[PDB]
């Protein structure tokens, strides 16, 4: 999942669209379709990720959201920016997945965040790596995320774009910080909830070295790549200040709201699920009705 379905296989479609950018620029309907589609994916996948109890599931939904952001970038007719985002995402999301794998291995195949806790100090190295990676994923300034995502948001705002697609991208940006706060608070922070017989041990040269390499990448590759590649996109130099800072503002809003809800989780107040929570946690019910009705009809008709 870390290699194929986080950084290489999943980006294949976006690469296909980028490779045909000279042709895609000619047509206009296709650009709008890509834009709207990507907006839908970002919103839906991030919304589902907010209420996922499996760490790998949260990371995978984050990957889907990122790919949707790249598709939106294609909708803004900004292919090179999308490719740059592909590179940066490959750098940091793979590190996030490796940290999740380390957590799972140390906790003896415990993938449910509800039974993971107090990992901030138990695994300092993977904690640092996850922190840096999540910050980059949320577009922390002067990180791999800052040199692609922030530019993508800026381009989307400063362009003739479907209004609702732009809105969905911005809302999705807050949800990005939300699921990051989820995978930080409910896993690394808090009190331990894992079973007894603590076997936590990340003192492995291979794991440390791999995550270290991806760390150095996540911290400096964005700057290096952006400052080395020849200029290919005309920048939106003059921009309203609030539009310029919108990415950071939305990220901060998401972080604050998610942390607030996580703190309220501490409060001894059990409450029954909301219908919206059921919708999000059931993945919008899509894998239920869209995986039973069509298959049933097809197989029954066939027989």
């Amino acid at each position: 999942s870390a290699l194929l379905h986080s950084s290489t296989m999943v980006v294949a479609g976006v690469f296909l669209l980028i490779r045909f950018y000279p042709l895609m620029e000619t047509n206009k309907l296709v650009q709008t379709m890509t834009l709207c589609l990507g907006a839908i994916t970002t919103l839906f996948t991030a919304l589902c990720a907010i209420t996922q109890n499996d760490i790998k599931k949260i990371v995978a939904f984050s990957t889907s959201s990122q790919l949707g952001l790249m598709m939106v970038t294609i909708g803004i007719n900004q292919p090179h920016l999308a490719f740059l985002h592909i590179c940066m995402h490959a750098f940091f999301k793979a590190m996030l997945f490796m940290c999740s794998g380390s957590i799972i291995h140390s906790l003896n195949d415990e993938q449910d965040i509800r039974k993971m806790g107090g990992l901030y100090k138990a695994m300092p190295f993977t904690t640092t790596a996850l922190i840096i990676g999540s910050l980059a994923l949320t577009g922390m300034p002067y990180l791999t995320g800052f040199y692609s995502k922030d530019l993508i948001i800026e381009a989307v705002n400063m362009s003739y774009t479907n209004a609702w697609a732009l809105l969905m991208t911005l809302i999705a940006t807050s949800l990005t910080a939300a699921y990051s706060t989820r995978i930080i608070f409910f896993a690394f922070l808090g009190k331990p909830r894992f079973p007894p017989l603590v076997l936590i041990n990340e003192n492995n040269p291979l794991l440390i070295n791999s995550i270290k390499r991806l760390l150095i990448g996540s911290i400096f590759a964005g700057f290096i790549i952006s400052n080395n590649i020849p200029p290919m996109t005309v920048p939106n130099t003059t921009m309203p200040l609030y539009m310029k800072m919108t990415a950071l503002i939305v990220t901060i809003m998401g972080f604050m709201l998610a942390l607030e809800l996580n703190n309220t989780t501490y409060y001894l107040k059990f409450k029954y699920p909301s219908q919206t929570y059921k919708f999000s946690n059931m993945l919008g019910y899509y894998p239920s009705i869209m995986h039973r009705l069509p298959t049933y009809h097809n197989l029954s008709m066939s027989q």
Binding site: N53, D109, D112, K191, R193, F270, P273
Partner: protein, 177 residues
Amino acid sequence: FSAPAAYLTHQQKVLRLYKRALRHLESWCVHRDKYRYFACLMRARFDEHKNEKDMVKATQLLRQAEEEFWYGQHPQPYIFPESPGGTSYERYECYKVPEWCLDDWHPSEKAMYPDYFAKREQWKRLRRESWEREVKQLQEETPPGGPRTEALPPARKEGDLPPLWWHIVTRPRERPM
């Protein structure tokens, strides 16, 4: 596992609901302290009707609790990693190779582990020797219209092994690797 029963008693059904309710509540209450607080409150609710004697009333209460459980069911409850539905469920199933394949090993392969296969032959002899008594014992303890329950009898007399024991005893290890 253990031999199944024809039906579940009302007491058994309530106990099953009790475990499910607590586990779902634990799934809801991520923090341990939060769960422990509400666990006792839920336990009290069961204690409130522990005295309840009327079976019709108790059955009516059971129906309501299950309806409440479904409405309060956690959409994504925690499942143990190796439990059915877990992430690691059936993960090592492929590595589990039946023991009868060892008899198909080439003599060279059996030479690589001589002591083990020698002990394996002893196990084979044990199975054949006891098999006749196993079937005979089952017939003696079998009701007229065959067995009505899947429960199997133990070894009544010394020198005999529990009937139908080979597969249970020689089953694959949890982690073959």
